[PDB]
Amino acid sequence: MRAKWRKKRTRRLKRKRRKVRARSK
Amino acid sequence: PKKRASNGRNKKGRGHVKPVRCVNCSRSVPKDKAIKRMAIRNIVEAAAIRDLSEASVYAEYALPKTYNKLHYCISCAIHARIVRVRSRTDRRIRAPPQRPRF
Amino acid sequence: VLVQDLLHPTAASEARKHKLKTLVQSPRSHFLDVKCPGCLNITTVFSHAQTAVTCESCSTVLCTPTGGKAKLSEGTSFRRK
Amino acid sequence: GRVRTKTVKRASKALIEKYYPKLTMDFQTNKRLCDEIATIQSKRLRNKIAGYTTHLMKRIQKGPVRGISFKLQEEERERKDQYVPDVSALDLSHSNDVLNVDTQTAELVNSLGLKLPLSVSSVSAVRDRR
Amino acid sequence: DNSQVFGVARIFASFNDTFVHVTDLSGRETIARVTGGMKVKADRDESSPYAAMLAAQDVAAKCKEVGITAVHIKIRATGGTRSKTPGPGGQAALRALARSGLRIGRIEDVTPVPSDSTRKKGGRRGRRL
Amino acid sequence: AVGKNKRLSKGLKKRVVDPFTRKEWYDIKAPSTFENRNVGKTLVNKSVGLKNASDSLKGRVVEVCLADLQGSEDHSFRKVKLRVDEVQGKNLLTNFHGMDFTTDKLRSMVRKWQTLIEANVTVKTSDDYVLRIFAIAFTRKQANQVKRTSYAQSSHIRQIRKVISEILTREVQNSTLAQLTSKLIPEVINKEIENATKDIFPLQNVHIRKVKLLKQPKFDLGSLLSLHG
RNA sequence: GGUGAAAUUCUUGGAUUUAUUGAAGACUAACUACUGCGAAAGCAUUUGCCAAGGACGUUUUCAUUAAUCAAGAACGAAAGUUAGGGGAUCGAAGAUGAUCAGAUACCGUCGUAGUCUUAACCAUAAACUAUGCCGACUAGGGAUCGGGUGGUGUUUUUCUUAUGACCCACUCGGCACCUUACGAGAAAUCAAAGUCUUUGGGUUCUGGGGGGAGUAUGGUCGCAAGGCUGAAACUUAAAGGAAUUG
Ligand SMILES: [Mg+2]
Ligand SMILES: [Mg+2]
Ligand SMILES: [Mg+2]
Ligand SMILES: [Mg+2]
Ligand SMILES: [Mg+2]
Ligand SMILES: [Mg+2]
Ligand SMILES: [Mg+2]
Ligand SMILES: [Mg+2]
Ligand SMILES: [Mg+2]
Ligand SMILES: [Mg+2]
Ligand SMILES: [Mg+2]
Ligand SMILES: [Mg+2]
Ligand SMILES: [Mg+2]
Ligand SMILES: [Mg+2]
Ligand SMILES: [Mg+2]
Ligand SMILES: [Mg+2]
Ligand SMILES: [Mg+2]
Ligand SMILES: [Mg+2]
Ligand SMILES: [Mg+2]
Ligand SMILES: [Mg+2]
Ligand SMILES: [Mg+2]
Ligand SMILES: [Zn+2]
Ligand SMILES: [Zn+2]
């Protein structure tokens, strides 16, 4: 990927992880 | 590798420059790196001056010229033959191409 | 210019160089004995005078200040100090 | 198409450089000359040599050409070089016996301390648009 | 002056259309409104020089039947932001006005030019043909 | 042709008939300050009882070339807009509306390596004509310059434009429309501006552009007849 | 209308044009350049106020008050976020019309959020000269901008001084540019990237093979987006720079 896209995909994964964490808490 | 010393942009001391739009692909490009051409032409071509001159009430009327500055994007101009690739040693020749009309 | 006498170089050269850069620092400005058209009083004025120097007896603008060297009045006559 | 490649040019140049006084204008004469003063395997090659040497003869009779340098044309050089006007252009003769210069070179002459006839005349400091 | 009836040509030429449209000195009322694209069917040659020439001949005939004798030339481009250059057909339209009997005078260009006033169609990166 | 859907939002036959037979011509006359006073001829639909043709006439604007009203070709670049306000019948009489340059001269004067000076002013005339006057200038290469450019510092520009404002205000506030136009036609204001600004910076191609009218008072017929004939 | 072609779309209730006008917001063309300023982001219609600044001139004043700086701060492009005012163009999402094997992509019409503003956030960009700052020295060339010097200089003109604008020479400071190496570099190139094995003028901040990864975790800032800080297990023999020939 472009490093730009890798960063964006990682950001979306972080967003999903934070949503799951907020649901769990 | 540094393609050009002047970065092919020609600012060197302004941080940022206002951008202007291409006339062919409507790309926003900085005004300094905008490879501009002044297109001074007549409203009629050389093949029509005769008919207009003979179809004119004014005998000595001289037809006026149309003026406009053209700001290209770089890709359109490389495509539209107005700007030409050069050999590496000939890149640095800043002077405009020598007038063929000598 | 591999060999030259920096201690005593040619006078035109030092006069050419900028001040604060000669062999010894010496200012280029000077003072002037100026005579006002009105009276016979003689007054001393700096070359690049910054204020409008006037005769003590009478209010007349001997010099008009500018960016560099002060400008004398038309009637006044000056002599180098 | 007939361009007379390397070998005929070299041979002709060497022959003229070496044997100028004994080459002529006629083709067949030069053919026999090149036959006697050069070893040439095939007759066609010698014919080409003769042709280009005749061309060189015509060129040299028109005027001296580059590259080639025989001793006799040095005599034409001697004649042209040795010519000289009897009266010098510089020797204070033309321009009505006047050396026309400006003040600074006059000061130069005086500083050197020698007597020269001068004619001082300042030049306007004006610089035109050119 | 032999009492020439004067008008203005008001030639508007885009890259996709050519407008030959004479009107009076005031310009308020319109004598002829035949369009360059009218004279052709392919719809890709609306701005083709032949279409402009034919529409211009139509305008010249309409003028000579109306009474118009002389015309002032008003060449126009699309103006605004789209383009600043005359349409490819308007030149042949002017030529056809020329070689059609009608007298011509006062040729000028009236392309509306903005003072860099608004955003231009295309976006940042523009057309990507 | 006929690349049409005819999606019309309907008669069997539409009588376009003759649009031009119900139309009549009218000759236009210029104010006396212009030399070749005759202007041209405009067409308009013939009179009807409900709507007066003169009503539609008063309010028309006509563009003319100044050389056409002068005869000389030293004024081919100028562009005078006149206003149709009063009609005598088969002849209509006009009042001054505005001035302009044809775009050709305008872009011709704007060259590179010289900074243009643009000035504006809004001003009431002697009687009531609220006008706005523009002024263009171009810095001139001296007759000796090796300096390729002829740029001017912003302070020079500001003093020059202050002088322009003073000159234009003085010229306009004093005179009326007829006097103002009679001044513009020989463009002596150009000479006055050049003379005043020759002290500050050498100036070239000074002109007066786009004489734009903002407001005109209540119409006076006698004055209009005075400006005519 | 629009295009390579088309179609979506608007139209004899007369669209498109033509003329006048008026409304609303936008931006400041041409001028505009190896030109200016600002710490950087950035800054371009006019003139009035307000304060600020660089440079120059200074036989003016104080006498080390200095440089760089962990900690802490002030600004900080665009996008984004809140609320309130705008609402023209342009326009992510979308709605679609076409190409295409597929095309929710390139092209064409519309079109919300934003684009523009007022307070509050955000603090990231290829925020690039991919060159930290302050000093001294080392090589020539013109130009260019600002300042200051001289010209029995040139025109100007107010009769003439004085200006101003120019011409010549010099000087200070700035953006740069040209040639060259005598030095530098792995070079491409550099007049600083030189004065570095003949290794030391003062200083902050970073990197130690490539991934894993600017990820996990932990703090802290933030309303949120996210920012700052920031690993390792494991895996790999290269990844990469510059130029050369194909
Ligand atoms: Mg590359
Ligand atoms: Mg700076
Ligand atoms: Mg392309
Ligand atoms: Mg689109
Ligand atoms: Mg309509
Ligand atoms: Mg502007
Ligand atoms: Mg400037
Ligand atoms: Mg710190
Ligand atoms: Mg912003
Ligand atoms: Mg809102
Ligand atoms: Mg879409
Ligand atoms: Mg679709
Ligand atoms: Mg749209
Ligand atoms: Mg960063
Ligand atoms: Mg960096
Ligand atoms: Mg930095
Ligand atoms: Mg590692
Ligand atoms: Mg990584
Ligand atoms: Mg955490
Ligand atoms: Mg890399
Ligand atoms: Mg490589
Ligand atoms: Zn383009
Ligand atoms: Zn006194």
What domains are defined for chain E? 3-129 (3.30.420.80)
Domain span at residue C13 reads 1-81
- Cα-to-chain-centroid distance, residue B76: 12
Among F197, F115, F207, F189, smallest CA distance to F152 is for F115
DSSP label of D122: -
Element (H, E) at C72: strand C71-72
How far apart are the C-alpha atoms of C21 and E120, rounded to whole Å?
A: 57
Domain count across chain C: 1
* E90 close to E13: Cβ distance less than 8 angstroms: yes
CATH of the domain at C46: 2.20.25.100
Q: Which amino acid is at F94?
A: T
Measured in degrees and rounded to the nearest 5, phi and psi for residue B95 equal -60, 140
Interatomic separation, CA of residue B33 and C1' of nucleotide G77, rounded (Å): 19
CA distances from D3 to A8, B75, D7, D61, F194 (A): 71, 47, 11, 22, 72
* E60 close to E94: Cβ distance less than 8 angstroms: no
Q: Is F17 (CB) below 7 Å from strand G?
A: no
How far apart are the C-alpha atoms of F59 and F83, rounded to whole Å?
A: 6
Strand spans (E) along chain B: 19-21, 28-30, 36-38, 41-42, 65-66, 69-71
| F10 token code pair | 């309907």
- Looking across all nucleic acid strands, the nucleotide with the smallest C1' to CA distance from residue F61 is G20
CA distances from F228 to B29, F37, F80, F93 (A): 56, 9, 17, 8
Among F95, F60, F55, F133, smallest CA distance to F218 is for F95
Among C21, C72, C19, smallest CA distance to C43 is for C72
| D28 token code pair | 């067949």
Q: Which residues are bridge partners to B41 per DSSP?
A: B66
E25:F39 CB<8 A: yes
* F203 close to F196: Cβ distance less than 8 angstroms: no
B57:E109 CB<8 A: no
Cβ contacts of D113-122, under 8 Å, gap ≥ 24:
D117/D92
Which ligand has the minimum distance to the alpha carbon of residue B4? Answer: 1
Strand, coil or helix: D123: coil
| C10 token code pair | 């040619």
Q: Categorise residue F30: left if φ over 0, alpha if ψ from -120 to 50, beta otherwise.
A: beta
How far apart are the C-alpha atoms of F193 and F205, rounded to whole Å?
A: 11
Residue with tokens 């070299």: D10
* B69 close to B36: Cβ distance less than 8 angstroms: yes
Q: Give the distance (Å) from ligand 20 centre to CA of residue B3.
A: 15
Q: Which amino acid is at F188?
A: V
Residue with tokens 């101009």: B77
* B35 close to B46: Cβ distance less than 8 angstroms: no
For this entry, resolution in Å reads 4.0
Measured in degrees and rounded to the nearest 5, phi and psi for residue E8 equal -130, 145
Among C39, C47, C40, C37, smallest CA distance to C79 is for C47
How far apart are the C-alpha atoms of F33 and F177, rounded to whole Å?
A: 10
What chain F residue is nearest to E46 in terms of C-alpha separation? F1
How far apart are the C-alpha atoms of B59 and D36, rounded to whole Å?
A: 82
Experimental method: cryo-EM
DSSP label of F228: -
How far apart are the C-alpha atoms of F229 and B52, rounded to whole Å?
A: 36
Measured in degrees and rounded to the nearest 5, phi and psi for residue D46 equal -65, -35
Strand, coil or helix: F210: strand
How far apart are the C-alpha atoms of B57 and B60, rounded to whole Å?
A: 9
DSSP label of A25: -
How far apart are the C-alpha atoms of F111 and E15, rounded to whole Å?
A: 29
Q: In chain F, what is the greatest distance between 2 CA atoms, to the nearest angstrom?
A: 80
Q: Which amino acid is at C54?
A: T
How far apart are the C-alpha atoms of E68 and B34, rounded to whole Å?
A: 47
With both helix axes pointing from N to C terminus, report the angle between F177-184 and F188-197 in degrees, rounded to the nearest 10: 70
Four-point Cα dihedral F75, F81, F83, F89, nearest 10: 50
Interatomic separation, CA of residue F129 and C1' of nucleotide G121, rounded (Å): 53
How far apart are the C-alpha atoms of B60 and B53, rounded to whole Å?
A: 9
Q: In chain D, what is the greatest distance between 2 CA atoms, to the nearest angstrom?
A: 78
How far apart are the C-alpha atoms of E51 and F1, rounded to whole Å?
A: 11
Element (H, E) at F124: strand F116-124
Q: Which residues are bridge partners to C78 per DSSP?
A: C34
